[PDB]
Swiss-Prot record, chains A, B:
Protein's name in the database: Polyamine aminopropyltransferase
Keyword Cytoplasm: yes
Taxonomic classification: Bacteria, Pseudomonadati, Campylobacterota, Epsilonproteobacteria, Campylobacterales
Organism (species): Helicobacter pylori (strain ATCC 700392 / 26695) (Campylobacter pylori)
Gene name per UniProt: speE
Residues forming the catalytic site: 155 (proton acceptor)
Activity regulation statement: Inhibited by methylglyoxal bis(cyclopentylamidinohydrazone)(MGBCP).
GO cellular component, one term: cytosol
Record-annotated PABS domain positions: 1-249
Length: 262, 262
C-alpha cells in the first residue's frame, strides 16, 4: 500500500511502502514508521514525513548554520520537536543541549529510526525536559524552534536568547508559499534586527523553509570557514551550501524586501 | 480529476486539475493542457510537466546562464525541445536563434500557453527548422539541448560550438539520481574541459538537472554582472541565483570528483 505527503491542497506526493513497522499514539501525537525501498524508513509524525536515509540533510544544515556563524556554543536550546539528529550534529561542538519535548513516549519511539539515538541520549550534556518550566534559568547562544512559532512563542524564546544569540525556526517554502513566509518574516522582525529566510539546497521533496533570526550576528558576514572545514563526518554541509541557502530570486527579494532584516 | 508525475517508481506527485483544455498528438509526441487552480495551466508533454504561471523560472535560468557568462553571443542554437520562452529571454541579447524541432504541429499547439509565443516566432532573428541539416552551416556561441543527449548527439553539437562557446544541457536531479547525473557528466567530460552540474534553486517541483559545458568559458569565473544588471525585465534570475545553482552537498562533490571539470 501507500501513504501521502501534503505539499499543497492541490498537489500531493504518494510514497509506496513495504510495510508498517510501528504505530505509537499519545494524547496529542500520532507516530507511524514504514518500510521503504526509496528511503529505508519513513516516519509519519502528525501529517508529516521523515526520511531515514536523508535525516542528515536538515540536521546538518541547521546545526552548522548556527555553529559555524558563532565562536563558542556553550548552551543551546531546542524546542517543539523530536529531532534528536539535530542534537547529534550539535554535539560536534563543545556544548550543552537542553532539549524540550513534553511527549517522551513519542520521542523514545524513534529509538531505531534516528541512527544516532543512543549516542545522543547517552550524552552527559544532553538534558531532556517535558517543559521549558522544568529547566534552570539561563540564556542560550542558539535556540532551535522545530515548528513554525506564533507571535507568543517567538517572544517567549527571544527572551531566553543571548545578545549575540541566534534563533533558528521553521517556516514554509518561500516560493511555493511566499505569503506564509512573508507572515513568518513579519513576526520575526518585530523583535529581531536580523531576520532572513533560507532553504535546504537540493531538497526537492518538501514544502519547508527556515529563518535565521538574531540581534546582530549575520549568517554570511559572520560566517566562519575554519569552524566549517573542521567538522568531521558531515555529508551534506559545506560553505557552498551555507551561502546558497540564502539565495532568493528577484521577485521574492522584492516581495520580502520590507520583511528582511540583514 | 488529477494527473500524475513520477519522481521514482515508488514516489509520484499528483496535481488536481479543473479540466482538460487541449489534447494534441503527433506520431512521436503527445501534448495535453489542463486548467490548474495552482498554476493557471499545466502542460503535460510526454509526461514532462510545464507550469504556465512559472515558465519564467527555467527560461530565465537557462537563457541567462550562458548569456551572462559570455562577452558576445550572436549565434545561438536550441535543439530537442519546444521551449520558446528560452528563446524569448535570449532575445534580450543582440543575437540570432536557430530553433530546431521537427514536430511543428505540437510546437504550434503552445500558441496560447507560451506568453511570448507570437513575439518569438515572428522575430526577424528567429529561424525555425525541422532538422539541423536544413540550416546555414555555422558555429554557435550557444547551444541548448533541452533533452539529455546521448554520446552521438553530444559529438555532433560539440563540433558546432565556437572557441569560447558554451553548451548547456539537461539531466536528472542528482539528489535522488546521482548515478544518472554522474554518467551525464561522464559523457560531457570526455569531450569538454569544462562540465559542471547545476539545478534551479527553489524549484522543489522539478526532478530536473542541468549541465554547463565548454572548452574553457567558465560559469562562475567568466560571469559578468554588468550583463546581469542590464536585464530589467527578469523576475527570477540574478547573480545570487546564478552562483547558488552550482552549489552541491559534500557527498556529491566527492562522488562527482572524477567527472567534474572546473
Amino acid at each position: 500500500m501507500w501513504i501521502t505527503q501534503e505539499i499543497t491542497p492541490y498537489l500531493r506526493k504518494e510514497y509506496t511502502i513495504e510495510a508498517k513497522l510501528l504505530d505509537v499514539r499519545s494524547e496529542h501525537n500520532i507516530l507511524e514508521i514504514f518500510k521503504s525501498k526509496d528511503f529505508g524508513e519513513i516516519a509519519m509524525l502528525n501529517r508529516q514525513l521523515l526520511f531515514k536515509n536523508f535525516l542528515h540533510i536538515e540536521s546538518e544544515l541547521l546545526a552548522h548554520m548556527g555553529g559555524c556563524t558563532k565562536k563558542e556554543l556553550k548552551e543551546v536550546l531546542i524546542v517543539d520537536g523530536f529531532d534528536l539528529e539535530l542534537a547529534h550534529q550539535l554535539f560536534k561542538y563543545d556544548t550543552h543541549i537542553d532539549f524540550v519535548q513534553a511527549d517522551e513516549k513519542i520521542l523514545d519511539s524513534f529509538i531505531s529510526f534516528f541512527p544516532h539515538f543512543h549516542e545522543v541520549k547517552n550524552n552527559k550534556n544532553f538534558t531532556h525536559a517535558k517543559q521549558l518550566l522544568d529547566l534552570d534559568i539561563k540564556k542560550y547562544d542558539l535556540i532551535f524552534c522545530l515548528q513554525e512559532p506564533d507571535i507568543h512563542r517567538i517572544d517567549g524564546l527571544k527572551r531566553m536568547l543571548k545578545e549575540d544569540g541566534v534563533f533558528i525556526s521553521v517556516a514554509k517554502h518561500p516560493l511555493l508559499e511566499h505569503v506564509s513566509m512573508q507572515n513568518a518574516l513579519k513576526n520575526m522582525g518585530g523583535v529581531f534586527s536580523v531576520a532572513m529566510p533560507f532553504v535546504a539546497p537540493l531538497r526537492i521533496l518538501s514544502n519547508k523553509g527556515y529563518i535565521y533570526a538574531s540581534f546582530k550576528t549575520h549568517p554570511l558576514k559572520d560566517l566562519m570557514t575554519p569552524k566549517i572545514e573542521a567538522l568531521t563526518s558531515v555529508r551534506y554541509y559545506n560553505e557552498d551550501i551555507h551561502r546558497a541557502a540564502f539565495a532568493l530570486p528577484k521577485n521574492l527579494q522584492e516581495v520580502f524586501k520590507d520583511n528582511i532584516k540583514s
